[PDB]
């Protein structure tokens, strides 16, 4: 149950604060299982807001809750987020075209990202289509 006021707080060091907050609100409103959190990325001092949780991905007439983490850089939305698939203990990363060994996601949408054409809602829409065709994680057989 986060609020825009709290989100603005998390992005005090960001270059485009309202734009980041506005899009975060749009994302967590449509995708109920994505939660905003202020955490450290790589270094304890590199605090950034990220959206963690799952997104609904239909795969062959069945919906799966794919675990992801979207790190919003302090330059969002002018630079793309850094995205990862976060496998749980019951699954394994499927390294392939759009996902590397570390679970980092690669997509044309991210590679050519540019404001205002690119946004998080558009990105997640792409993920749903792409992952629906080629799941980035699979359950342990």
């Amino acid at each position: 149950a986060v609020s825009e006021s709290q989100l603005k707080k998390m992005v005090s060091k960001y270059k485009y604060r309202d734009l980041t907050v506005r899009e975060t609100v749009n994302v967590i409103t449509l995708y109920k299982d994505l939660k905003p959190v202020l955490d450290s990325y790589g270094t304890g001092s590199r605090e950034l807001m990220n959206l963690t949780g799952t997104i609904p991905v239909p795969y062959r007439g069945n919906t799966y809750n794919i675990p992801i983490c979207l790190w919003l850089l302090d330059t969002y939305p002018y630079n793309p987020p850094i995205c990862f698939v976060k496998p749980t203990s019951s699954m394994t990363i499927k390294t392939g075209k759009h996902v590397d060994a570390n679970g980092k996601i690669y997509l044309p949408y991210l590679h050519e990202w540019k404001h205002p054409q690119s946004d998080l809602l558009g990105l997640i829409q792409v993920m749903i289509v792409v992952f629906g065709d080629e799941p980035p994680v699979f359950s342990r057989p």
């Binding site: 809750n65 794919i66 976060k86 019951s90």
Partner: peptide, 9 residues
Amino acid sequence: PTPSAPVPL
């Protein structure tokens, strides 16, 4: 609301 993934082929 629990993470899930499809079974392998």
